[PDB]
Amino acid sequence: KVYSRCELAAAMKRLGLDNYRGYSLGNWVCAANYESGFNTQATNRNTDGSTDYGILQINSRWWCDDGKTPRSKNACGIPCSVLLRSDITEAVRCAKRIVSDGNGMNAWVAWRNRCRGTDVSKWIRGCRL
Ligand SMILES: [Cl-]
Ligand SMILES: [Cl-]
Ligand SMILES: [Mg+2]
Fold this sequence. Notes:
Blueprint: H1 5-14, H2 25-36, E1 43-45, E2 51-53, E3 58-59, H3 89-99, H4 109-115
Antiparallel strand pairs: 1-2, 2-3
This protein binds chloride ion (2 copies) and magnesium ion.
């Protein structure tokens, strides 16, 4: 599923992402925009044999188990396939776990490079949440 911007913003608000551990909602929408283009089925295979999965491009070394990645920690305690669901609930739970660590949203390269320093509140403008 490719979400629209406001659809995603509403779904993320519903699941408690707005101002979760210091990151306002616009940060989460911005990150999803740049990481995946709002696409729950996005996948990108990395140089290290890990794959990034779903709308927030969550990585299979550290966070989810895909049975294909050396040295995998599976810190979210999930199969990576749950991160390709049209329902974002499992991805949001895992994202909250990720962002709890000292890296914060720097876990998401596209957030670090594309969203950090920008007016992220623009991502929720005009939306009914
Ligand atoms: Cl915001
Ligand atoms: Cl949670
Ligand atoms: Mg990416």
